[model samples]
Target: GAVDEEDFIKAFDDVPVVQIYSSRDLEESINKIREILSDDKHDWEQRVNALKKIRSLLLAGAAEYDNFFQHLRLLDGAFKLSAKDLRSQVVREACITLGHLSSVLGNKFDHGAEAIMPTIFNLIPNSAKIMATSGVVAVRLIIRHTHIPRLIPVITSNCTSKSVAVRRRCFEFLDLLLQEWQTHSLERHISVLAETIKKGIHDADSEARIEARKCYWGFHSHFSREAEHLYHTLESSYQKALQS
Candidate 1:
């Protein structure tokens, strides 16, 4: 197995705060963690351990590690670094660490969650499909815990991406978002979403264009007549092409 059997259906592992304790040696502890993650002298196995331990500490530390939370922006830099790495396992562990952090921190960790969405989205298309699917799983886990709608900026903005892979996935992203969201949540944003969807439908690549069309009709059925109204706004040639 490259890792676990497919993880998309659920997340792995859980930590209970049954013995929650605060860190008093926060100074050496913080410095010790930095040594493992930032220093290249550490190998991937150690780096993976470092990733695991941080989430564990936070799990046990909870809100008591005041010194720890403030540095998350700085701390998570290494996480994002690991996530962006080319090594398959490092990136995989990095994404796993991010999701575990989400489970431990819940809504309080949302800013961190928001930061990784675009990072993973951009990472997905560049990776091998097996690896790219890992990126996709990390994102789906994020959606499960919330902040997905806030992730829309990256989704819609990337609709015009130069990579056909990115664009195709972007539309798939639209369908996912729309499936989970209600029309009221989307009403304000659909104007732009539908516009970008129109672009996807018109994409030059066959799969990209196919996926885009699927999302458009998904929008049509999900959002109703004004969506079809937009298709009507399309030139006669495209309207005729799409109707059937």
Candidate 2:
């Protein structure tokens, strides 16, 4: 439950540059790319092949001139790849590609981020370690130049997931959001965020409870009155747990 620098750094796996010899070469790279990403005819590796190529091209500057992110289609395809890929490597590839996309495209990424956000979130509960780390990394980069209002709802909505892992992820996301966003930006979602913190501290799962505890304190500092107001409604013991 503690943070690890190495684990966080590993998520942005390198996408080496592929030389673009000519305009034709660059165009050819994107040609039928969506088909490859969505093709059931191919194995997961081939889809990852498409993802890796897209990522490498992104690093090589495809997004700068080729309008790689102009439409929602590419973003949709990328989200689906990471969102539902059966193969772990492909999802990792998808997450890395997404991280690269937001960093390169910046504000342009807002086009379809709301749609993309949840799939990254879905990985948290269900994925293995690396994919989960990659998903969080992707979300972090996405938030740097994103429509955060669109993103906040996705995190808050997942706070009640059936899987404890999923709920823990929401707490973790809230923690990140708290650190990254200005308090003024968070003003609109106050009620739901407060409610999520309330549920988190009372949650049955130990790890989620621990995560909620940390999140609760973080929430306390930023929204002191609101956090205190919620704290009072809790049972006496839970309030004591927060003090310790």
145-212: candidate 1 lDDT, tens digit per residue: 55445666667787888887777777777766667666665666777878888887777877777677
Predicted structure with the largest TM-score when compared to the true one:
2
Give the poorly placed runs of model 1, Cα more than 4 Å off.
Answer: 1-11, 14-19, 23-35, 54-71, 102-108, 240-244
Q: What digit string (tens of lDDT, one per residue) describes model 2 on residues 1-244? A: 2243334335434545687776676666676567677765567877777777776776676665654455334548656755577777777777766766676666677656676788888777654787677677777667655646657777778888997878877787777777777777788888888898888888888888888888887777779999989988989999899999
Root-mean-square deviation of candidate 1: 4.0
Give the Cα lDDT of each candidate. Answer: 0.67, 0.72
**Range of the 10 consecutive residues with the lowest summed lDDT in candidate 2:** 1-10
